[PDB]
Amino acid sequence: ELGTAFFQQQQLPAAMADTFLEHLCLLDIDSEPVAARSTSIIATIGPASRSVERLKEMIKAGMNIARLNFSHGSHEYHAESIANVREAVESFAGSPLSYRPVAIALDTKGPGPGLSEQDVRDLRFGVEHGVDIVFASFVRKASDVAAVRAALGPEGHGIKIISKIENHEGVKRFDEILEVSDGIMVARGDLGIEIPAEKVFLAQKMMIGRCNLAGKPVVCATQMLESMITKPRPTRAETSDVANAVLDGADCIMLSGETAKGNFPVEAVKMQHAIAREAEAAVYHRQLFEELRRAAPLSRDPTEVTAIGAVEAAFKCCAAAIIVLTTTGRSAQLLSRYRPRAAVIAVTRSAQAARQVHLCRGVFPLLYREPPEAIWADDVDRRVQFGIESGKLRGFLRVGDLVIVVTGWRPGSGYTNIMRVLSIS
Amino acid sequence: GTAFFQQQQLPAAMADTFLEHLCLLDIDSEPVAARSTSIIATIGPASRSVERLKEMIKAGMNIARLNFSHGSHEYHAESIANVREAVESFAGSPLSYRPVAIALDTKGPGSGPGLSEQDVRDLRFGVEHGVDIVFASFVRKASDVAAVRAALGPEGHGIKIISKIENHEGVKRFDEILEVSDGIMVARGDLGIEIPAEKVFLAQKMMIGRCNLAGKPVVCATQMLESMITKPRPTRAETSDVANAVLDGADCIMLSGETAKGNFPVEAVKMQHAIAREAEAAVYHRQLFEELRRAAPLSRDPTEVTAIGAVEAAFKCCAAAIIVLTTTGRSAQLLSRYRPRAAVIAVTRSAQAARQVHLCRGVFPLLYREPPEAIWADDVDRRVQFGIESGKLRGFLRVGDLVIVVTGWRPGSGYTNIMRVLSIS
Amino acid sequence: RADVAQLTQELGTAFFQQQQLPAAMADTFLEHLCLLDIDSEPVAARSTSIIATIGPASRSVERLKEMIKAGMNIARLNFSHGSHEYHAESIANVREAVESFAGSPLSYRPVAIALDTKGPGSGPGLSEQDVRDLRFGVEHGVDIVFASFVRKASDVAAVRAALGPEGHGIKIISKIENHEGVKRFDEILEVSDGIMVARGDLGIEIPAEKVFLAQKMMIGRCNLAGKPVVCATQMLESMITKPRPTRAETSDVANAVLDGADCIMLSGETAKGNFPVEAVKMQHAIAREAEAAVYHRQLFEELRRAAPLSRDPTEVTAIGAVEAAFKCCAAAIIVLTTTGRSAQLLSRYRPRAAVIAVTRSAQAARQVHLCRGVFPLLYREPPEAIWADDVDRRVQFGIESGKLRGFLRVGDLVIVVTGWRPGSGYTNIMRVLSIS
Amino acid sequence: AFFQQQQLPAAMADTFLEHLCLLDIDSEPVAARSTSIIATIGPASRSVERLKEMIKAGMNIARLNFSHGSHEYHAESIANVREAVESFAGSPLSYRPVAIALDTKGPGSGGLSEQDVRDLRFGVEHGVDIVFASFVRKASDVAAVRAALGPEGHGIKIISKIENHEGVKRFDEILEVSDGIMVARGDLGIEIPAEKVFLAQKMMIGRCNLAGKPVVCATQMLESMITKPRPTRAETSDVANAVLDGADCIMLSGETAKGNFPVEAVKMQHAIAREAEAAVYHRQLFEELRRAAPLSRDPTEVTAIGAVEAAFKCCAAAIIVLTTTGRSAQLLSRYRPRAAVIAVTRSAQAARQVHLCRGVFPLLYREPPEAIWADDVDRRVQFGIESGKLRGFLRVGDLVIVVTGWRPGSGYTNIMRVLSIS
Ligand SMILES: O=S(=O)(NCCc1ccc(S(=O)(=O)c2cccc(O)c2)cc1)c1ccc(O)c(O)c1
Ligand SMILES: O=S(=O)(NCCc1ccc(S(=O)(=O)c2cccc(O)c2)cc1)c1ccc(O)c(O)c1
Ligand SMILES: O=P(O)(O)OC[C@H]1O[C@](O)(COP(=O)(O)O)[C@@H](O)[C@@H]1O
Ligand SMILES: O=P(O)(O)OC[C@H]1O[C@](O)(COP(=O)(O)O)[C@@H](O)[C@@H]1O
Ligand SMILES: O=P(O)(O)OC[C@H]1O[C@](O)(COP(=O)(O)O)[C@@H](O)[C@@H]1O
Ligand SMILES: O=P(O)(O)OC[C@H]1O[C@](O)(COP(=O)(O)O)[C@@H](O)[C@@H]1O
Ligand SMILES: O=C([O-])C(=O)[O-]
Ligand SMILES: O=C([O-])C(=O)[O-]
Ligand SMILES: O=C([O-])C(=O)[O-]
Ligand SMILES: O=C([O-])C(=O)[O-]
Ligand SMILES: [K+]
Ligand SMILES: [K+]
Ligand SMILES: [K+]
Ligand SMILES: [K+]
Ligand SMILES: [Mg+2]
Ligand SMILES: [Mg+2]
Numbered sequence A: 001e002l003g004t005a006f007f008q009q010q011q012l013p014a015a016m017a018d019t020f021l022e023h024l025c026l027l028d029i030d031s032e033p034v035a036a037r038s039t040s041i042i043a044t045i046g047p048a049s050r051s052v053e054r055l056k057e058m059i060k061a062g063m064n065i066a067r068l069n070f071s072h073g074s075h076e077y078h079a080e081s082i083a084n085v086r087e088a089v090e091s092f093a094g095s096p097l098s099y100r101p102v103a104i105a106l107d108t109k110g111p112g113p114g115l116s117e118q119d120v121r122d123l124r125f126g127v128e129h130g131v132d133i134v135f136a137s138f139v140r141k142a143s144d145v146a147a148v149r150a151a152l153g154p155e156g157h158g159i160k161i162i163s164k165i166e167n168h169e170g171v172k173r174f175d176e177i178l179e180v181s182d183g184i185m186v187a188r189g190d191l192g193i194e195i196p197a198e199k200v201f202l203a204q205k206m207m208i209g210r211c212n213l214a215g216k217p218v219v220c221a222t223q224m225l226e227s228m229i230t231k232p233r234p235t236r237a238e239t240s241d242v243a244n245a246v247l248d249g250a251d252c253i254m255l256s257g258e259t260a261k262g263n264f265p266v267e268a269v270k271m272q273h274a275i276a277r278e279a280e281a282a283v284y285h286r287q288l289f290e291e292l293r294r295a296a297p298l299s300r301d302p303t304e305v306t307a308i309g310a311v312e313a314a315f316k317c318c319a320a321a322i323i324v325l326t327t328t329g330r331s332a333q334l335l336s337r338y339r340p341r342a343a344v345i346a347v348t349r350s351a352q353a354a355r356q357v358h359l360c361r362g363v364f365p366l367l368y369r370e371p372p373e374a375i376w377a378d379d380v381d382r383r384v385q386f387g388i389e390s391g392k393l394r395g396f397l398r399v400g401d402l403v404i405v406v407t408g409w410r411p412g413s414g415y416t417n418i419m420r421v422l423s424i425s
Numbered sequence B: 001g002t003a004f005f006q007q008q009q010l011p012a013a014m015a016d017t018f019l020e021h022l023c024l025l026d027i028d029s030e031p032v033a034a035r036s037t038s039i040i041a042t043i044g045p046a047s048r049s050v051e052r053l054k055e056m057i058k059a060g061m062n063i064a065r066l067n068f069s070h071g072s073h074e075y076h077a078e079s080i081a082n083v084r085e086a087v088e089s090f091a092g093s094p095l096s097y098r099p100v101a102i103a104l105d106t107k108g109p110g111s112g113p114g115l116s117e118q119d120v121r122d123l124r125f126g127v128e129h130g131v132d133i134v135f136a137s138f139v140r141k142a143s144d145v146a147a148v149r150a151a152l153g154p155e156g157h158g159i160k161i162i163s164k165i166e167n168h169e170g171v172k173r174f175d176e177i178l179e180v181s182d183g184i185m186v187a188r189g190d191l192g193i194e195i196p197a198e199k200v201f202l203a204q205k206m207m208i209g210r211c212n213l214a215g216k217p218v219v220c221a222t223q224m225l226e227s228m229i230t231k232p233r234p235t236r237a238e239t240s241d242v243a244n245a246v247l248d249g250a251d252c253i254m255l256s257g258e259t260a261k262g263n264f265p266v267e268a269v270k271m272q273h274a275i276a277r278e279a280e281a282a283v284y285h286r287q288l289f290e291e292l293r294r295a296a297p298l299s300r301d302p303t304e305v306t307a308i309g310a311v312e313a314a315f316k317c318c319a320a321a322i323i324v325l326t327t328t329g330r331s332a333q334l335l336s337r338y339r340p341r342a343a344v345i346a347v348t349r350s351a352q353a354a355r356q357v358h359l360c361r362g363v364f365p366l367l368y369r370e371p372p373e374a375i376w377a378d379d380v381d382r383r384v385q386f387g388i389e390s391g392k393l394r395g396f397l398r399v400g401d402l403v404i405v406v407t408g409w410r411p412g413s414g415y416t417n418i419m420r421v422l423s424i425s
Numbered sequence C: 001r002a003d004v005a006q007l008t009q010e011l012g013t014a015f016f017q018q019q020q021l022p023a024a025m026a027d028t029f030l031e032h033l034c035l036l037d038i039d040s041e042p043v044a045a046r047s048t049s050i051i052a053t054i055g056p057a058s059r060s061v062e063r064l065k066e067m068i069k070a071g072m073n074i075a076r077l078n079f080s081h082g083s084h085e086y087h088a089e090s091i092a093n094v095r096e097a098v099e100s101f102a103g104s105p106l107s108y109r110p111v112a113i114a115l116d117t118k119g120p121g122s123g124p125g126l127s128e129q130d131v132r133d134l135r136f137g138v139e140h141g142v143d144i145v146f147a148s149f150v151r152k153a154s155d156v157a158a159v160r161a162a163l164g165p166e167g168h169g170i171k172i173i174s175k176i177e178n179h180e181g182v183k184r185f186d187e188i189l190e191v192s193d194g195i196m197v198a199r200g201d202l203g204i205e206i207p208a209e210k211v212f213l214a215q216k217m218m219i220g221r222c223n224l225a226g227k228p229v230v231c232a233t234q235m236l237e238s239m240i241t242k243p244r245p246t247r248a249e250t251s252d253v254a255n256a257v258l259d260g261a262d263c264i265m266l267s268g269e270t271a272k273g274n275f276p277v278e279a280v281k282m283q284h285a286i287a288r289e290a291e292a293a294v295y296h297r298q299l300f301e302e303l304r305r306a307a308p309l310s311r312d313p314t315e316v317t318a319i320g321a322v323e324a325a326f327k328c329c330a331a332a333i334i335v336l337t338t339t340g341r342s343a344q345l346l347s348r349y350r351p352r353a354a355v356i357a358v359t360r361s362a363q364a365a366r367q368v369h370l371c372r373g374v375f376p377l378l379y380r381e382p383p384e385a386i387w388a389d390d391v392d393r394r395v396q397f398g399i400e401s402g403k404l405r406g407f408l409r410v411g412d413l414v415i416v417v418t419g420w421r422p423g424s425g426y427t428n429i430m431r432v433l434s435i436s
Numbered sequence D: 001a002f003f004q005q006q007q008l009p010a011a012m013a014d015t016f017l018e019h020l021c022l023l024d025i026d027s028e029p030v031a032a033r034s035t036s037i038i039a040t041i042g043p044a045s046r047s048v049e050r051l052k053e054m055i056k057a058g059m060n061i062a063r064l065n066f067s068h069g070s071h072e073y074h075a076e077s078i079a080n081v082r083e084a085v086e087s088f089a090g091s092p093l094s095y096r097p098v099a100i101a102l103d104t105k106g107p108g109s110g111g112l113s114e115q116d117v118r119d120l121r122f123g124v125e126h127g128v129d130i131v132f133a134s135f136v137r138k139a140s141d142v143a144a145v146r147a148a149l150g151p152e153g154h155g156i157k158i159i160s161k162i163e164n165h166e167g168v169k170r171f172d173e174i175l176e177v178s179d180g181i182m183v184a185r186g187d188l189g190i191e192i193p194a195e196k197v198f199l200a201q202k203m204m205i206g207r208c209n210l211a212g213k214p215v216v217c218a219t220q221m222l223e224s225m226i227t228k229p230r231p232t233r234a235e236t237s238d239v240a241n242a243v244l245d246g247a248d249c250i251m252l253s254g255e256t257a258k259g260n261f262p263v264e265a266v267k268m269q270h271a272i273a274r275e276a277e278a279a280v281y282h283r284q285l286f287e288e289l290r291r292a293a294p295l296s297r298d299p300t301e302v303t304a305i306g307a308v309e310a311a312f313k314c315c316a317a318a319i320i321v322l323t324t325t326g327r328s329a330q331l332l333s334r335y336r337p338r339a340a341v342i343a344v345t346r347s348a349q350a351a352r353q354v355h356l357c358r359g360v361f362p363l364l365y366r367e368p369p370e371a372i373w374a375d376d377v378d379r380r381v382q383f384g385i386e387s388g389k390l391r392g393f394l395r396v397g398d399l400v401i402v403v404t405g406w407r408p409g410s411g412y413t414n415i416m417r418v419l420s421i422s
């Protein structure tokens, strides 16, 4: 029905293994990855990656989120970076095969006894310029997150706050920080100076694990492909680090100086893309899914209940994709927390939600711009078919494939409760 | 509530090991779920009366067995009529009507190699009188099942064939017999004479395990409550035997002389009901569900894919029930094979399918009598509501419960593909 | 297949078809059930002990010799019936039949004698008759007391007090026969040597459909605690009058063994029934089949995970020895024991290898029948001058008895468990020996 | 306090997810560092005084890269290593043996090159303990190296370097005839796509752990430390992940051979390895190793598993084993105990070679012999206890597992004892 060749690709022999030891033993360098790359790439924008033409190359290479480091540059400089990013993104708004939404993240300068005057001003700039994410520097306690939240003024409550853990206090107060944050960034640069360098891997693995348990995005950052700032190829330790961040459970991987000031920004994005695809296929879904399953508490929220049912159904038939209709991105996030091997194609009318779902591993956003149908059920089918036709166009789907479709019983956010098994025609 | 988590062996169900599970079993933890293992009662002089059969239906009898080793065709036609009269005496209240299957147990081949002439005549009698199941005696090979199928003719295509394994050859050729049969009966009486008495438990446990693996019904039969033929209470070995047949994985438990000729046919049914409810709550679903999921192969059939997604969703929210619309009973059978703790309420218009789904553990058949609505989505909703109303009346559901609703995308058998999370109002 | 491939080439394909070995290699319990084979013959010696109640049907010395040969390990004296004179005669007849085989020490089979008390009845504590019967047991050298209707830890303390200073070595097995005993189980097990699931009274005190929950819970907790547990009453009830049992009865025996019971009992089946020897033979046949059907892969891991860390060298050596025995498919584990404790600690990890316990204590040899898989050997030789040579003679005695009885063959591996100095409590050594 | 150290809360976890969640940066490692450090000897690490600092820092194996330097140069390196090692022999209870490994130049465009035949004969003549055979592609390559060592080099360990696609594809046949493997990531990263090397590393480490044979992770582990005093975040992560993968040895090439911070690179590998070893999820690892290991009728193999099981049961501080060839210690090591495997040996070569096995701490027995063999055994067991106490492995009140044999000579290990310290 699928062929012997299908079961030799994307580490399927290693995925069938009964133990983790057998899984490692069955990893094959000749087993090619087939699924789309699911770990998002955050690229820091700087002199090496600011031009509209250079940004088009980086979008094509795999950049999903553009990071603006507010430790350097003026508001005028960053507004120009935003405009250049938006111009390069909208240059693909014709052909859907190349049109991909790109998120814009503001990385704050940091504190000091409270939120800094500069941080308050930069956060206000982010709201005024419609940024999607804030990477809040040096978060030490829950009250730091609340201060950043307060600063996202009256109009920026939809912006996602990703708290950067950069010191011992942040590591120790992690649970209270994650509870009030949208996600976490393992800011290894400062963390490696604040705590012993040989202890950073424990902090990374712990934080990634707790974020996977909570179902919140986690970013692995700093010195991932450091040598690529000057050299065209990375070291053996660097490719290993990227692969292990993906295997650890990181939703996003980041490039700092590699894309901001280095000689090979596009090549660094291409390298992260190549390694992430390989590492995602090497994930031991058998144990991962059962552990996520057992660790997740019982839920009476129909979205959460539908998400696990959909991911279970996708594994049962080797579904090509899970197509989900989402207004805020939440239904796609709850599918993503169970780490399916199937791509989560999220169809949304919210341009912000389409940009923000790049924070979640395996979510492929589609922005729907069609005029609404008079009958709601008709409008729902039109978006499901949009997901299928885009999936076909991009290579995710083919006729005869099975897809899982996640929808809700009534319009508006918060009513996801339906899972359909559909044959692609 | 705290009280909810003390009932139906919920502390023992949360255990991380089978040893801890046994240690947490509580005699004060009352069973809450409806009894899911079916009771087959053999009809005879002690249970032939229409008034006596009404008491047995109320006590829990799901399948009426006609032993064709005794009695004439005239005798068995009268048994069938009395059963049908007692069953239809409750059809005035459709929300509480309980369907009862009629099974013909053949006399067997005796000294002969193949299908006896009496068996051919009895099988044609069964087709003419509309029996739902055939318990084919002394099945030794796949060709014996084919001969029974041939004797049933074109009109008996819908009758279910449950092969009785009564000797060493049947045990050795088990796989080929199960492949062509609808299910199996562990006929312990003859099996205990054909093979050493001390080896029968190995044959019972093996056959039950293989039927659970295959997703096909398995009946445990003979001497389960033997002492209740003359005594009002069973022995300690007898209650233990019933409990262990349920814990082994048997879909059905049987009463022979206990209901056919004894002095306690109603009490024997009540006893089997009481023990089965206790034993079903003591099932270690944590290990069982994982093992059934792991052992079940990948499938591209949307009914099979929806079934596993629905059972996974039911466990996630502690769903009170899984309401399924079924024409042939197949959708209910595929839900049943994953052994959910949630009751599988099967709503059907087929009176034969409603009788035959009693062969599957945890399937509660509801016969829907209304003629089809003009709008198909309205006819579907009306059936789902009938399942909710019946389930509320019978104690399966209460307001505030979560239920998983399993339906299809078009009318007719074979199109189940939808799973939706519903809240009882 | 790679985890057995070499041992398969060495021991042969036939070895791996016997004693439910394909079912034992299974990765899941479902696969284990699926692989159970009626043609896979049991090879190991029967490890669950058989307790036979002595009565009119089983009192003659000649009848008792047949029952010893059939598999009876413990003789139960029901003090609810019969006088002290009657029970002293039963004891004498049992001892006469047991000692009739003492001529060959390499094949002698010890038999324990257990006194089952009448109980408190309407009373709150120890009855006057129980005090008199317990005093009789001490005077007649009984090995075990099955204390009727134990409801709390103070009941077991009263039985211990009644046994006095001379009955300190007697094992107290508390009978759980009512709701209070089930609810206060943990405190009762803590102060008892073991438990008996007295299903007859328990089935009247609590709903009959709840007894299996009580049986499975108590057996599980006793397995967790490492203390003996007996399953009792109506196991082969129909065999009192019929030569073959019902399908529910064989199932019940098999399931008590599969549950984790150390001992299985016969009451009326041997005390008054027409087939006492046939009932013992039936329990023996079913137990041997059920023991091979145990899913040791999950059982050993669960016992291992549930057992807390220990700093007692006997406990540490016991787990190391059972692990070593599973690694090489050891035919037996030979252990030197004074009180039976080292053998009991090996037994709690439920090895598939027979635990051959070599002891000089005739009482310990009788009492280790309470522990599943322990095969007692009574050493009658006087002590050697060098202790290190006395120990080596006791190990060789175990190897010779094991060879003589069919437990060991040339080429087999055996695990030997000993201590560093004489006296009880110093077990700390494990050795891997090849049988020549 | 004992249960808060060495990631013990994370070790008690019922799932790997819970294990990651419980990892604590404040939980200090207490056990001795188990993963051996191989340091490449070069201009930056050749002086006797420099080598004493590297021995003190944690270097267990000295690698001589025969791709550069003459036989005269390498003989001087060997002499300087031996001089620095023997400078600590005055205190036998604290003396640390150091192995010497010859890394061959390789076949290049060619079977076994003429230079390799000459270098292998040099190794035999100079008493090297290990050979890291470059570019092994098939079992016949290993046989050729074995032949070039001759009858005088029967005891040298051959660690095959997997550096290309053919070596990865023919891995099983190479491991079968080799003593161990080296994941030579430098050449492997050029021969196969750079993004596929982690799959080859994890597969080879897993198969070596399965086989019970040593596996070395090599190349660019702390590369930036050649010029900088601190490594990158990717580098510390790489070292930690090689240990977490199951590597018996970790290597330093340019970092120690030509770099500005050779001692600091050794100290860094030591610090990371200790942290990573405590973060190992022994609950799942031991079970998987147990299940995957086949049934055995060799009493050494049977005693090894029984001893590791007993060590976990009592939280044994160490497993003291008497070994002639190092085999009994290797069979204990394959089950990855948390307890240190203190191997007491009279063979100086076996003491150097057991560094290839993770968690084996070699002690050279140089005390006078007892007339009664039973007394000679108990004295060697007391030697292990005294060296253990002095080095911090043992304290009074600890439990130890002692592994011995029934008769003198190699191949007779069959006894395990539970002993209380003092
Ligand atoms: O032998 S054992 O290793 N376990 C096996 C017993 C058992 C029974 C039932 C289930 S089920 O998860 O309900 C289930 C699963 C699959 C198929 C199925 O039909 C049922 C699981 C396990 C053992 C015995 C005693 C013990 O006291 C112990 O700790 C371990
Ligand atoms: O996809 S996973 O299932 N990877 C399992 C990862 C893992 C790693 C190490 C060990 S080991 O027990 O130390 C060991 C055992 C055997 C061989 C060995 O060399 C090591 C066990 C498990 C997963 C990822 C992220 C998670 O957050 C999660 O919950 C599950
Ligand atoms: O993920 P979110 O934000 O909860 O959105 C999911 C919602 O999308 C839908 O599928 C479609 O809703 P709309 O028609 O309003 O877009 C709803 O039925 C469901 O509640
Ligand atoms: O279990 P079966 O026999 O395949 O029946 C399931 C069928 O029932 C339905 O839910 C309802 O169908 P009907 O309207 O014909 O009753 C179908 O959509 C589905 O195909
Ligand atoms: O099982 P127990 O009662 O602790 O007895 C085990 C004892 O038996 C021995 O192996 C032999 O001791 P004895 O010389 O007293 O018979 C002791 O070394 C050990 O302490
Ligand atoms: O690990 P190896 O090489 O097999 O050596 C283990 C050997 O060491 C001993 O424990 C002590 O032997 P020696 O007295 O010859 O040193 C032997 O009994 C055992 O056979
Ligand atoms: O700010 C950061 O990215 C860091 O500190 O690693
Ligand atoms: O037919 C039966 O029921 C039997 O033989 O047990
Ligand atoms: O006393 C007993 O043995 C009983 O009640 O079962
Ligand atoms: O020779 C090596 O070690 C390499 O190339 O990595
Ligand atoms: K910044
Ligand atoms: K019949
Ligand atoms: K009594
Ligand atoms: K080289
Ligand atoms: Mg920073
Ligand atoms: Mg029959």
Ligand SMILES: [Mg+2]
Pocket: C148, C177, C198, C200, C201
């Ligand atoms: Mg009683």
Ligand SMILES: [Mg+2]
Pocket: D163, D184, D186, D187
């Ligand atoms: Mg190289």
